[PDB]
Design a protein around this ligand. Structure first.
Ligand SMILES: CCCCCCCCCCCCCCCCCC(=O)OC[C@H](COP(=O)([O-])OCC(O)COP(=O)([O-])OC[C@@H](COC(=O)CCCCCCCCCCCCCCCCC)OC(=O)CCCCCCCCCCCCCCCCC)OC(=O)CCCCCCCCCCCCCCCCC
Ligand SMILES: CCCCCCCCCCCCCCCCCC(=O)OC[C@H](COP(=O)([O-])OCC(O)COP(=O)([O-])OC[C@@H](COC(=O)CCCCCCCCCCCCCCCCC)OC(=O)CCCCCCCCCCCCCCCCC)OC(=O)CCCCCCCCCCCCCCCCC
Ligand SMILES: CCCCCCCCCCCCCCCCCC(=O)OC[C@H](COP(=O)(O)OCCN)OC(=O)CCCCCCCCCCCCCCCCC
Ligand SMILES: CCCCCCCCCCCCCCCCCC(=O)OC[C@H](COP(=O)(O)OCCN)OC(=O)CCCCCCCCCCCCCCCCC
Ligand SMILES: CCCCCCCCCCCCCCCCCC(=O)OC[C@H](COP(=O)(O)OCCN)OC(=O)CCCCCCCCCCCCCCCCC
Ligand SMILES: CCCCCCCCCCCCCCCCCC(=O)OC[C@H](COP(=O)(O)OCCN)OC(=O)CCCCCCCCCCCCCCCCC
Ligand code: HEM
Ligand code: HEM
Ligand code: HEM
Ligand code: HEM
Ligand SMILES: COC(=O)N(OC)c1ccccc1COc1ccn(-c2ccc(Cl)cc2)n1
Ligand SMILES: COC(=O)N(OC)c1ccccc1COc1ccn(-c2ccc(Cl)cc2)n1
Ligand code: FES
Lengths: 29, 117, 60, 70, 49, 49, 49, 48, 98, 386, 385, 29
């Protein structure tokens, strides 16, 4: 409801990591 | 608590007469400093008050904005007739805030919202 | 006090003459002040100019 | 947005009926005494910690200079 | 105490003042001190003839 | 060049003097007091050759 | 007790008192200082030009 | 180092003097436009 | 993909040029000085520091606490000579020559 | 609309100028502390006009940059006036904005409904710092080289992508001609972003109007901007131009360093590296931490506790005229930002290591002892009541 | 206002973007000729972003300028893409604006109530010409020197002041390092004036809205900008980026001159001095007058008869769809601006001296035979009835 | 009309004698 709001909302945190290394490959860190 | 009551503490009975001195020279009350643009709940407490009480507030505020443009104070005849700390607003503002804490614990949309600037 | 009505008597009941007086009065005033700075300067410094060099013409 | 209904009476004179300049040098002894007997705890809080720190540094540097001399 | 030097005094130069100028006969003499004592090991390179 | 200038002077470089009164602090009283300031050292200081 | 703003619309008195803390008035029966007020504002409009 | 010092001290005396005349005009112009407000009388009805 | 190509092409042109990278490794020489003094010589765009420290410097130098170091390592490995020390003259802190 | 025309200032071609610059309603008791905002928009126009004419004679190359600035001072008609107006004019732009900010802290101008006006001005203060720093490198003297080395190498303490940050900012392995050429291109660009962020910062104030010295609701006594606050702003633009002319004609080098008249040499270091006077408080906080990665992490909480002032709430009194305790804390913070500026031009030694560690702590105790009067203060009308 | 909030796009922080870029009412029959105006605002942003990165590697000095442009092409990562996007991108910015202007002449978009929209765009066309000319000098080749000599000396035919104008523009007695340094400073400045004059040119159109292919009052059938004219403007930004990519990757030097690859030598003259293709029509009018002071005085009546089109009145029909005679004059003017561009790259000889004197006359007979249909045409409803 | 004519003329002889007042500069008078 409100759990499914965040249980969705933290995988856009991760859709954004599939995206955050998609072009830059930030390497050393 | 225990550090703000002026009839027990000595350094709160000198903070009290410092604001009382500074309010009398413009002829203001402490509740005239509450802005309906700062807090949207102060706008609602003033719509539930009688028209004659809100009109005396608007005339104390105009007399004081006129004294500070001219760089002067009230004459000392009129300064002995002033009552700061005589309130008109605190009880109606506590009632509006108590009704809002009940509409949130029980579900229900807010009655007025702030515009996003 | 009679020069104060008489100076407004003649010139500015009009708005193009007025712009003459502020442009042309900006000149007589700029030359009255450039003249006084250029004479207080050469009175504080006597014997220190370029034409006061005793050996000017003769280097050889 | 900008309306407060009001009730008042105002009177006003013309600019060319008053004295414009002489109200500056009017009671300057009285004007000076009002500003400095009301703003003397706001200058004891601005210059106080600066005069007292400059005194500490000049005393510290005058005792490690006389301890290095032979 | 000898790490930044000794402090120099203040001399009343003839070009110090709000309406004071250069002494042009002393500029004339100082170019002659430069060109005979100083120009053998120092350059100017910004000043033309 | 700068390399031939240090070689004729013991490694040290004599600077450019076209802005030397602006380049140190108190630059007019410093050049006067330096040129007329060569003294004898105090007791305990030794100088290189 | 009549309101002060009500007792002022009902009594048009011809003896008006202004606020005289910053400006004093020229007593009634004096000419207007309009020509003096123009010539002070010209000698600054000389300067901005 | 400073070959401009005489052209500079003579231009700065001309314009500090001329600008202290425009400061006397602008303080008269300010106090003339503000005198109807600074001397007005106002009656209001409120007491305390 | 079009936003991917453009942003990388604008940001990679600021990195380092092919002529800057061609001047990044070479071989240069020094001269001699006496034990305990200082003279520097240039390599690419920065100096090469210098020490041949004396016999009084064999003390107050290496036998100080190893556990009080910001990074603990023996003096014997930074030196390659028992009395010389000459290594690239830029401080690891902020790029200043001290 | 009306059926035929009237005053031409009420026409669509001049409505945005009429209702925002002529007829705009203003509180009638505004003092001269409300004058430093138009004074800062004049200082920005002076820097743009003077710099556009300076860039017609400047060469961004390491072999030619120092000699292009002496060519302006010596061979260009009036060129010494063009440089001294621009070097000293960046000090006037920072004096005026520093007195602007301390007005807003005394009268609590960041409060509701004016939070977006405060946060758009913290962005403006960040664009001013980057522009003045990046422009101090083009003269290419000994302080334009050893100041760009001390600051750009401070990003080498960031975790493990930070060694790739500094060699991408530099364009190489050191500060050199790749760095001087890109610092010139960014310096023509950033003043024009600063212009668009100042017009945006003024549209946010014309949604609610201005605050006043009493702190109250003011819609019952308001006059128009023209002629009343135009003629008292004009007294401020003439008193400013006198003060600015004693820095161009009679003391043009007092506010600088002599070491920027030596051409840049990367082999020796100057004895003392000191910035301009307006960077001295953040330079003393940055050198107060004995760890370097904790020094960059003490500059970012300066701009975080500034951006998070207007979001604490419970304070119905705004002005410090009626607040006697927070008024005494204002004069005790101003004595600390002037003591942090003194420390930032001293050697890093005793005793300036202890006197430079306590004022960074006192500077951060101002933003934590504001909200506690937001709790103890709201129980005043229930105790002092008569 | 309302008592509580609703859609966040109707909040004050995003009202100016909502009512002018999303909910703005648009005529429903606009064709693809109404698409070249947002395409020209993308071409201006490409020139600003590409030029800010080009200026991090360029040196404005006569001993160092030609070799800084070859250093970008050879040693900077992707630097050949940064130059070819900027040199060919100035040709795309002029193709798009030339098709924009000929839309407004066919459908008579300068007419009432839209006179201030036309006159703000004649100022934009003047700032574009000065910016492209002043920027063609920084590479400092043989055509960057002998084109700045032919144009700046043309002000030496203005009466008594004249020869004081040219030596103040030059900074000396010829084109040299004082001229290359001040042409660089003005070239960073003038694109940012061009930005503020384009936002002002759009506030004048959002006071009355847009014209339509029929020319009529259109307030009874109007839809919103999003999504309808956003998704058909997006078809135009992708068809443009294909056409722009056949000029960067497969033909990057077709639209230039080879003589700008020789470094600048003031002792010899090139055999033929020809400008870029988008300056060729005004270059043929300027060389058509056999007097030089009458050549500068034929360029200023080009920008006077442009600025004085929307002030002739009596024309109630706007669109050329319903006007069969003025429609045939439109296609006969377009054939003349393409014939004046051909003449401007030919030698000054026979027969191109007669064929280059008649099309400057036919070009000026378009702006005098417009208002005569503004008189003969308004007696049509009393005859054909 | 006829006032606006001459009132066009009075300040049309201002430009003439206001740009005849910023460049060529006989300055004793
Ligand atoms: C004979 C050719 C017949 C083909 C259709 C008409 C056409 O393309 O003629 C040119 C056409 C008008 O000519 P027309 O013969 O009078 O035809 C009337 C059209 O129906 C005019 O009506 P319309 O403008 O609404 O067009 C309807 C549309 C119908 O298509 C759709 O349904 C749209 C969906 C996309 C599919 C395609 O058909 C098209 O024209 C296809 C899209 C063409 C535009 C390309 C996008 C921007 C042009 C270049 C960008 C910058 C470079 O011009 C335009 O549509 C505007 C500009 C396109 C040409 C620019 C370059 C050439 C010079
Ligand atoms: C918007 C409308 C603008 C149309 C775009 C025109 C263009 O892109 O440049 C034409 C283009 C410019 O090339 P160019 O090398 O600068 O020609 C001048 C040379 O000096 C070679 O000179 P030329 O003596 O051999 O004759 C020049 C002739 C083409 O050269 C010939 O081969 C002679 C045959 C005719 O092309 C022209 O330059 C005449 C067009 C004048 C430009 C009109 C600008 C006014 C816009 C209103 O002329 C060509 O025909 C080259 C082939 C590429 C055409 C496809 C481009 C599609 C767009
Ligand atoms: C140009 C600058 C000089 C002229 C200043 C005024 C410009 C005209 C804009 C009008 C304005 O000042 O306020 C606009 C906006 C919404 O204000 P609004 O409440 O809708 O209007 C009634 C106000 N009593 O008030 C605002 O809050 C604007 C905030 C900035 C605009 C949003 C952009 C930020 C989004 C990222
Ligand atoms: C817990 C510590 C208690 C602090 C408050 C104790 C004194 C009470 C007080 O605030 O008195 C008001 C005091 C002076 O009041 P006032 O009469 O207006 O000033 C005279 C100058 N005109 O106003 C003040 O002096 C306040 C000074 C600020 C306090 C400094 C430390 C913060
Ligand atoms: C808050 C704004 C920043 C606070 C001011 C920081 C400067 C502190 C003043 C100071 O004493 O040092 C600056 C400078 C010292 O010069 P310096 O070359 O470093 O010599 C070593 C000192 N014996 O001395 C100076 O030159 C003074 C510089 C002018 C100061 C202007 C006033 C700053 C505040 C104005 C806005 C309020
Ligand atoms: C070189 C030059 C550089 C100049 C840089 C300036 C940058 C230009 C940016 C434009 C600044 C002006 C803001 C314009 C915004 C605007 O015009 O608003 C649209 C206006 C609103 O319509 P309206 O119904 O009247 O709203 C009132 C609410 N009751 O709708 C209108 O009625 C528009 C009125 C026409 C104004 C233009 C003519
Ligand atoms: C380029 C720099 C700036 C410009 C041009 C500018 C401009 C202005 C102007 C013209 C005003 C009008 C009212 C007045 O003068 O008081 C104003 C108000 C204001 N400014 Fe700025 N400002 C700048 C920087 C800043 C900064 C750095 C801050 C804060 C961190 C700030 C915060 C404010 C606030 C809070 C107000 C409203 C205060 C009130 O109305 O009482 N501004 N600004
Ligand atoms: C379009 C805007 C600007 C341009 C083109 C410009 C141009 C220049 C140029 C060419 C120089 C080098 C010449 C010299 O050393 O005097 C310079 C230096 C400098 N600029 Fe700017 N400038 C602009 C705006 C600004 C602004 C807005 C600021 C400050 C907020 C600023 C601060 C500085 C400073 C501090 C220097 C150093 C001057 C010195 O100390 O010698 N500039 N600028
Ligand atoms: C802030 C904006 C701009 C900057 C900083 C800038 C910068 C530059 C620079 C550094 C060059 C020389 C490098 C080279 O030759 O490729 C150049 C050339 C040029 N610029 Fe720009 N530019 C800007 C905007 C524009 C605009 C808006 C236009 C056209 C309307 C334009 C037209 C040109 C042209 C035609 C060249 C000649 C390039 C060639 O033919 O080789 N520039 N620009
Ligand atoms: C930097 C260059 C320009 C930009 C960014 C620009 C932008 C725009 C935009 C976005 C529109 C609305 C969309 C459209 O109708 O296609 C428009 C319309 C218009 N523009 Fe431009 N324009 C530019 C140059 C010009 C020029 C050079 C002229 C004329 C000499 C002009 C005259 C017009 C006219 C008459 C309209 C009328 C709209 C209609 O007919 O419905 N513009 N402009
Ligand atoms: C006018 O510039 C100088 O005075 N510069 O720069 C050559 C100088 C000269 C010598 C020493 C130090 C500096 C710089 O001092 C500081 C102190 C803090 N910042 C800073 C800069 C940018 C950012 Cl984002 C954040 C913080 N800079
Ligand atoms: C991209 O620039 C070139 O192609 N340039 O310039 C180096 C060139 C090269 C060779 C020959 C001629 C030119 C210039 O051709 C023209 C023709 C008319 N104008 C013009 C320019 C400015 C103004 Cl205000 C008004 C008219 N310019
Ligand atoms: S090396 Fe010690 S601070 Fe840079």
């Amino acid at each position: 409801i409100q759990p499914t709001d965040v249980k969705a909302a933290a995988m856009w945190g991760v859709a954004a990591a599939t995206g955050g290394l998609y072009l830059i490959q930030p390497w050393g860190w | 608590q225990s550090f703000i009551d002026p009839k027990k503490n000595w350094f709160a009975a000198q903070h009290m007469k410092a604001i009382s001195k500074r309010l009398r020279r413009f002829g203001l009350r402490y509740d005239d400093l509450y802005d309906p643009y700062y807090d949207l709940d102060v706008k609602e407490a003033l719509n539930r008050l009688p028209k004659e009480v809100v009109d005396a507030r608007h005339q104390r505020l105009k007399r004081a904005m006129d004294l500070s443009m001219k760089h002067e104070y009230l004459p000392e005849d009129l300064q002995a007739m002033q009552t700061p700390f005589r309130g008109y607003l605190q009880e109606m503002l506590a009632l509006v805030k108590r009704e809002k804490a009940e509409r949130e614990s029980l579900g229900g949309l807010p009655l007025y919202q702030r515009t996003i600037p | 006090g009679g020069i104060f009505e008489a100076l407004y008597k003649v010139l500015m009941r009009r708005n193009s003459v007025y712009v003459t007086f502020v442009i042309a009065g900006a000149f007589v005033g700029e030359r009255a002040v450039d003249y006084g700075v250029h004479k207080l300067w050469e009175h504080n410094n006597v014997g220190k100019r370029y034409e006061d060099i005793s050996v000017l013409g003769q280097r050889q | 947005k900008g309306f407060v209904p009001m009730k008042a009476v105002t009177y006003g004179l013309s600019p060319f009926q008053q004295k414009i300049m002489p109200g500056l040098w009017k009671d300057l002894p009285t004007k000076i005494h009002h500003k400095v007997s009301e703003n003397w705890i706001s200058a004891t809080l601005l210059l106080g910690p600066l005069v007292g720190v400059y005194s500490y540094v000049q005393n510290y540097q005058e005792k490690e200079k006389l301890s290095h001399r032979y | 105490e000898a790490e930044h030097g000794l402090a120099c005094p203040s001399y009343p130069w003839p070009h110090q003042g709000i309406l004071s100028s250069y002494d042009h006969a002393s500029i004339r003499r100082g170019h002659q001190v430069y060109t005979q004592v100083c120009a053998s090991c120092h350059s100017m390179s910004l000043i033309s003839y | 060049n700068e390399a031939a200038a240090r070689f004729a002077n013991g490694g040290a470089y004599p600077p450019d003097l076209s802005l030397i009164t602006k380049a140190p602090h108190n630059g007019q009283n410093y050049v006067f007091a330096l040129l007329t300031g060569y003294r004898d050292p105090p007791a305990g200081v030794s100088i290189r050759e | 007790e009549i309101p002060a703003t009500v007792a002022a619309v009902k009594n048009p008195s011809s003896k008006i008192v202004y606020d005289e803390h910053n400006h004093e008035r020229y007593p009634p029966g004096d000419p207007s200082k309009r020509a003096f007020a123009y010539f002070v504002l010209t000698g600054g409009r000389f300067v901005y030009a | 180092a400073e070959p401009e010092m005489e052209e500079r001290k003579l231009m700065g005396f001309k314009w500090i003097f001329v600008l202290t005349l425009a400061l006397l005009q602008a303080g008269y112009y300010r106090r003339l436009r503000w005198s109807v407000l600074k001397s007005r009388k106002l009656v209001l009805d409120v007491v305390n | 993909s079009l936003v991917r190509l453009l942003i990388l092409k604008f940001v990679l042109s600021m990195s380092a040029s092919k002529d800057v990278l061609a001047l990044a490794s070479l071989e240069v020489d020094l001269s001699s000085i006496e034990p305990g003094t200082t003279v520097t010589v240039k390599w690419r765009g920065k100096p090469v520091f210098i020490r041949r420290r004396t016999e009084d410097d064999i003390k107050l130098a290496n036998s100080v606490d190893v556990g009080s170091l910001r990074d603990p390592q023996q003096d014997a490995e930074r030196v390659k000579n028992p009395e010389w020390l000459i290594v690239i003259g830029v401080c690891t802190h902020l790029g200043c020559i001290p | 609309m009306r059926n035929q025309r009237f005053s031409l200032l009420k026409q669509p071609i001049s409505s945005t100028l009429n209702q925002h610059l002529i007829d705009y309603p203003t509180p009638s008791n505004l003092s001269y502390w409300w004058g430093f905002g138009s004074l800062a928009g004049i200082c920005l126009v002076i820097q743009i006009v003077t710099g556009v004419f300076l860039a017609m004679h400047y060469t961004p190359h390491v072999d030619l940059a120092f000699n292009s600035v002496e060519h302006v001072m010596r061979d260009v008609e009036g060129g010494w006036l063009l440089r001294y107006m621009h070097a000293n004019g960046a000090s006037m732009f920072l004096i005026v904005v520093h007195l602007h900010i301390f007005r807003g802290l005394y009268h609590a101008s960041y409060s509701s409904p004016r939070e977006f006006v405060r946060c758009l001005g913290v962005v403006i203060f960040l664009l001013m710092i980057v522009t003045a720093f990046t422009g101090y490198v083009p003269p290419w003297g000994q302080m334009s080289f050893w100041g760009a080395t001390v600051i750009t190498s401070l990003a080498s303490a960031i975790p493990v992508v930070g060694d790739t940050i500094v060699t991408w900012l530099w364009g190489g392995f050191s500060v050199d001609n790749a760095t001087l050429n890109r610092f010139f291109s960014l310096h023509h660009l950033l003043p024009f972003i600063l212009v668009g962020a100042s017009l945006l910062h003024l549209a946010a104030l014309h949604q609610y109007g201005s605050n006043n010295p009493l702190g109250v609701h003011s819609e019952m006594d308001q006059i128009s901007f023209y002629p009343y606050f135009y003629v008292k702003d004009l007294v401020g633009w003439v008193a400013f131009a006198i003060f600015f002319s004693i820095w161009i004609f009679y003391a043009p080098n007092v506010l600088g360093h002599p070491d920027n008249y030596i051409p840049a040499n990367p082999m020796p270091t100057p004895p003392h590296i000191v910035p301009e006077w307006y960077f001295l408080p953040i330079h003393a906080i940055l050198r107060s931490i004995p760890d370097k990665s904790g020094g960059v992490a003490a500059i970012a909480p300066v701009f975080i506790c500034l951006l998070a002032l207007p979001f604490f709430k419970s304070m119905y009194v705004r002005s410090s005229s009626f607040r006697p305790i927070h008024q005494g804390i204002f004069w005790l913070l101003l004595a600390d930002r002037l003591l942090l500026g003194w420390i930032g031009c001293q050697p890093v030694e005793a005793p300036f290591v202890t006197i430079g560690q306590i004022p960074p702590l006192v500077f951060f105790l101002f933003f934590a002892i504001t909200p506690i009067p937001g709790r103890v203060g709201r129980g005043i009308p229930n105790s002092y009541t008569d």
